[PDB]
Amino acid sequence: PANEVTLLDSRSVQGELGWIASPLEGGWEEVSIMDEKNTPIRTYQVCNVMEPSQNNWLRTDWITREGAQRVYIEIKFTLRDCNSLPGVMGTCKETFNLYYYESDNDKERFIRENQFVKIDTIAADESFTQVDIGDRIMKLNTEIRDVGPLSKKGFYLAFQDVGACIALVSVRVFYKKCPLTVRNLAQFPDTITGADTSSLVEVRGSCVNNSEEKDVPKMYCGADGEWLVPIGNCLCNAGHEERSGECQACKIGYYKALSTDATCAKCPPHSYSVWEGATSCTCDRGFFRADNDAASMPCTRPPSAPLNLISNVNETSVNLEWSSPQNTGGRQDISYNVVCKKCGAGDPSKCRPCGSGVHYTPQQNGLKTTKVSITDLLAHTNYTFEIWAVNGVSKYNPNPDQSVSVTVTTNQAAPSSIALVQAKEVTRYSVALAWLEPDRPNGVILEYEVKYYEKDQNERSYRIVRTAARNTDIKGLNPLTSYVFHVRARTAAGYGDFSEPLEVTTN
Amino acid sequence: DRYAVYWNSSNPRFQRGDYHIDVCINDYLDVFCPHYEDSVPEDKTERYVLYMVNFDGYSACDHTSKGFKRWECNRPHSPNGPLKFSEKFQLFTPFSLGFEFRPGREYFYISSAIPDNGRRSCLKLKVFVRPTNSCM
């Protein structure tokens, strides 16, 4: 019934025990009496209390060790009180000797009576049957004796009667074992106990298949048959959680990239759910993640092109200006790449790329600044520049669908000053404005800028409005105040000039 | 020294009713259950529960509050021939429940059928222990 592995038992025997008794006749007898319920046992009895001198031997069959160090013997026996039975004192006894002999031979024909090693003279503890004459009651005394260390293949057991009235009910032969337990995520196997009751066995158990040994896992096997407090911890591998005592896989929609004490984290925003036991949640179509980027980070989108572009030309150099992009995607690392196309010269789409050594003062490509300057260009030639918005993920992601570009000419002059300005609708709150296009545009007109500053009063902040149309108005202005306006023409070529200083006083 | 008794209705000694055996001190008694071959469909098969009763239980064939349960002939298809039960006629018994025997006294044994007799007549055995004067 106990966790201890049994070697020899009176109940477990196939039919008869078949034990050698010396002497055969007038010695130990195989008198079998049935025990409740339906259990057949071979009971050994001897009662030669009357005869003066008594010597008895009962040798058991071959008992294999099976890799055991210390064996525990449990004997169940019934006795008789020498005073309760008629006869001379001393002739009757209340004690019996126990013997053991180590051997390597499987089927030994005979074992010497002198070669046996004595263990202890056993008496019925605590109480013993007399037996009571009025009513008959069964005994409850079971005696245990230990034997070790053992060197040979196996052993034989013997019993010696010195003139007592004894009945051996059951003989239990077992060896104390440490159970197979999985503690601190590491597996520990079943182990045998030491040579002594004080002895302990150091058991270094291997970790689970889906785990890695961070610390050496070890335990001590106690002689009683129980495992001791663990030394060293084991942690489950990446993509496997430390739950239920055995390495489990991450659920559908969960991941683990590093072998940490924490459980499988849920997929980051915009990340596609992978199968059971995932290292990192994969990025779905349209969203991606960089190689040098952390696994915890969400799937980032590529950047949009910068919406506004401003260009200014010099005698041999050109200047480009732009703002921040609309959709960052998530990543903060945004750099700008300037690409020379040379497609401006000529009407067809087919063109030759800028092969000549084009020099750039801030940076060639991957510029973190919002402004760029091209040092050298060829005169009388039409060029076209593409400002590419580059992300840290844009390389891993597909090449951006669009990039804001502007076609500019090096030799062409900036637009001239505007001829005249006229106010069409003047009121106490609003002042309308209308103007003509400059006499010399030197390129297609793209934008107009109007200045707004206070006259006959302290130098205020000159407000500049941007309008593609040649007509504009103002909302929210103080009455009875003088204002001066200047219209400036802006083309692809560059910066224009201020207009006629129109003094308009509010109604 | 040893006494062999075959417990079955087919036996001519049991049919008489006055079946008795004279035994001595430290003698053995072997009771054999009715053994049947595998060809038997277990219908004609005999099965008995043995009891150790007194003089009142011997004549009336009753075991309730008169005797104690001894042996049972449950499985007739035993591997090593018939079922054998040993009984030693010892003066003193080392076992707590083990039955003792006195010289110059009578001991009785009865058997009841498992499927039945109907309390009419039972297979009985009379056991007499010869005194110390008769035994050597």
Side-chain angles (χ1 to χ4, degrees):
Chain A
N3 67 93
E4 287 83 61
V5 183
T6 52
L7 295 163
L8 196 98
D9 208 294
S10 297
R11 272 169 281 263
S12 299
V13 77
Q14 200 179 281
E16 299 94 78
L17 269 172
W19 290 355
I20 303 104
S22 75
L24 281 301
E25 282 177 38
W28 291 96
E29 288 138 84
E30 213 166 14
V31 182
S32 299
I33 296 157
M34 294 291 283
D35 194 10
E36 288 80 11
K37 291 172 179 182
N38 306 98
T39 55
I41 308 151
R42 302 277 160 183
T43 306
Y44 275 107
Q45 298 165 55
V46 68
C47 201
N48 302 319
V49 296
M50 46 175 80
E51 189 65 30
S53 60
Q54 276 298 317
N55 294 100
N56 257 287
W57 275 272
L58 184 72
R59 185 170 58 85
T60 69
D61 301 335
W62 167 259
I63 314 142
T64 318
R65 257 168 74 249
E66 289 290 289
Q69 232 90 78
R70 216 171 200 193
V71 177
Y72 296 82
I73 307 137
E74 190 191 282
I75 314 139
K76 309 201 177 192
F77 59 92
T78 318
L79 268 168
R80 286 268 260 187
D81 205 346
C82 301
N83 50 69
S84 67
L85 276 313
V88 190
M89 57 184 174
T91 62
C92 171
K93 283 282 188 286
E94 281 161 50
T95 48
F96 85 110
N97 305 276
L98 191 74
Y99 293 87
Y100 93 102
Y101 176 76
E102 290 174 73
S103 184
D104 298 283
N105 193 276
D106 299 87
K107 287 177 182 177
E108 197 82 77
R109 216 158 173 95
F110 164 72
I111 298 284
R112 196 179 178 92
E113 283 168 55
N114 189 82
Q115 232 86 88
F116 273 109
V117 184
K118 208 171 94 179
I119 302 132
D120 195 87
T121 320
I122 325 151
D125 166 78
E126 193 188 72
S127 61
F128 70 102
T129 55
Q130 41 270 86
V131 191
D132 296 309
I133 45 90
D135 48 79
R136 292 272 127 103
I137 190 81
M138 294 274 202
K139 61 92 198 175
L140 282 147
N141 67 90
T142 57
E143 292 285 287
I144 194 145
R145 294 291 192 271
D146 57 273
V147 67
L150 298 135
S151 184
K152 290 179 185 178
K153 201 179 180 180
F155 76 103
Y156 292 94
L157 276 160
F159 310 94
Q160 206 196 297
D161 168 70
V162 290
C165 198
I166 190 143
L168 304 168
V169 187
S170 186
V171 181
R172 284 193 190 180
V173 178
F174 56 88
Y175 64 99
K176 285 186 181 184
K177 272 179 78 160
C178 284
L180 198 137
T181 188
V182 188
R183 303 265 166 268
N184 276 258
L185 287 307
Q187 291 171 266
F188 291 90
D190 298 292
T191 46
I192 54 111
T193 55
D196 213 88
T197 37
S198 319
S199 186
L200 294 139
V201 183
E202 193 195 69
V203 189
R204 289 204 166 179
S206 59
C207 212
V208 178
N209 295 280
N210 304 289
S211 185
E212 200 181 79
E213 280 170 51
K214 199 86 201 168
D215 208 291
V216 186
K218 64 176 179 182
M219 271 191 185
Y220 284 92
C221 181
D224 61 306
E226 264 284 292
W227 54 274
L228 288 187
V229 194
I231 313 115
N233 55 78
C234 198
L235 282 87
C236 290
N237 211 77
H240 293 279
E241 60 189 278
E242 280 150 77
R243 196 76 63 186
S244 299
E246 291 161 9
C247 293
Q248 211 84 62
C250 305
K251 288 178 183 178
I252 308 137
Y254 295 92
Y255 77 104
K256 197 183 177 182
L258 279 146
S259 59
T260 54
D261 209 83
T263 52
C264 308
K266 206 186 178 182
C267 294
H270 310 280
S271 200
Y272 200 86
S273 170
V274 220
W275 293 85
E276 206 179 286
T279 312
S280 188
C281 295
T282 189
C283 291
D284 58 75
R285 291 154 149 218
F287 286 86
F288 291 100
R289 209 187 290 162
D291 303 82
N292 287 265
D293 195 33
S296 299
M297 304 290 278
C299 298
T300 50
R301 259 179 176 172
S304 60
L307 278 171
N308 63 270
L309 227 164
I310 303 106
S311 54
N312 180 272
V313 87
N314 203 82
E315 272 71 38
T316 190
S317 56
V318 77
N319 292 283
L320 297 155
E321 198 183 294
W322 69 98
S323 299
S324 61
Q326 258 282 97
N327 280 259
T328 57
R331 287 284 289 251
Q332 304 291 283
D333 56 336
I334 296 152
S335 58
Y336 309 100
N337 295 34
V338 181
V339 175
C340 192
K341 235 187 166 192
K342 217 175 183 180
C343 309
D347 192 89
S349 59
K350 281 196 173 181
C351 39
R352 286 183 183 179
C354 302
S356 57
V358 179
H359 306 267
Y360 319 89
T361 193
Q363 240 183 284
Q364 297 192 284
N365 295 303
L367 173 76
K368 290 279 178 76
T369 325
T370 40
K371 203 192 188 168
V372 81
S373 301
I374 295 97
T375 85
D376 294 79
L377 297 147
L378 275 142
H380 304 266
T381 326
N382 238 283
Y383 284 86
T384 181
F385 304 96
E386 298 205 82
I387 294 144
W388 293 9
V390 171
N391 215 358
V393 293
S394 63
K395 185 193 170 184
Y396 195 86
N397 282 75
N399 298 295
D401 55 82
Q402 257 201 81
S403 186
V404 171
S405 59
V406 68
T407 305
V408 295
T409 135
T410 78
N411 215 85
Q412 74 166 14
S416 61
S417 185
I418 284 102
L420 72 98
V421 282
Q422 199 78 67
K424 305 301 279 86
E425 199 84 73
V426 180
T427 46
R428 57 204 281 104
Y429 45 84
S430 187
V431 175
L433 285 163
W435 60 90
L436 258 151
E437 57 194 301
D439 304 76
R440 288 159 286 269
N442 302 274
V444 185
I445 334 106
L446 287 138
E447 213 173 62
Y448 290 106
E449 285 188 353
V450 189
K451 286 182 165 211
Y452 296 94
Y453 66 95
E454 231 181 320
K455 199 238 174 181
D456 275 294
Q457 223 267 309
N458 264 322
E459 263 290 283
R460 220 190 190 175
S461 57
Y462 66 102
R463 300 157 184 93
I464 300 160
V465 297
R466 289 186 177 197
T467 315
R470 285 189 280 264
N471 307 277
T472 199
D473 287 71
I474 48 96
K475 289 159 186 178
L477 216 81
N478 302 283
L480 289 146
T481 42
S482 300
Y483 284 88
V484 189
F485 323 117
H486 296 279
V487 174
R488 195 187 60 85
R490 205 172 218 170
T491 62
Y495 216 83
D497 300 300
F498 72 97
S499 291
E500 190 184 286
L502 203 79
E503 286 168 52
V504 176
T505 313
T506 41
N507 182 267
Chain B
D1 207 292
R2 281 195 167 259
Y3 284 81
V5 174
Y6 296 94
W7 210 286
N8 58 85
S9 59
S10 300
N11 201 280
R13 299 276 281 183
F14 274 95
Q15 287 170 75
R16 291 181 181 98
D18 60 277
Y19 187 36
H20 79 284
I21 45 101
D22 300 278
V23 291
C24 267
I25 297 295
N26 306 311
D27 288 38
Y28 283 90
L29 185 82
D30 300 286
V31 184
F32 299 93
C33 294
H35 187 83
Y36 293 94
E37 291 176 295
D38 294 278
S39 59
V40 182
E42 286 180 280
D43 295 284
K44 288 171 88 183
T45 301
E46 288 175 79
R47 283 171 283 261
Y48 298 99
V49 175
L50 299 145
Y51 296 98
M52 192 171 177
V53 297
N54 60 313
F55 191 83
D56 297 278
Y58 186 81
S59 188
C61 279
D62 192 81
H63 56 264
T64 314
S65 298
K66 285 152 101 185
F68 321 100
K69 200 182 100 284
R70 199 83 195 90
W71 311 301
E72 290 176 288
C73 298
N74 50 70
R75 196 183 281 137
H77 297 83
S78 35
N80 298 17
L83 292 164
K84 200 185 96 176
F85 293 109
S86 297
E87 182 73 271
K88 193 186 170 75
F89 297 110
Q90 60 199 314
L91 290 151
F92 327 105
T93 322
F95 193 77
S96 56
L97 212 264
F99 302 96
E100 285 181 286
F101 293 95
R102 310 280 177 259
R105 269 101 182 182
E106 286 177 292
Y107 296 93
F108 311 99
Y109 293 92
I110 62 142
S111 60
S112 60
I114 299 156
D116 64 292
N117 299 290
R119 291 176 186 179
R120 294 181 287 104
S121 296
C122 70
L123 290 163
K124 58 193 90 183
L125 176 85
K126 197 236 265 181
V127 182
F128 173 75
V129 185
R130 282 195 285 171
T132 54
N133 191 78
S134 297
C135 304
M136 287 285 113

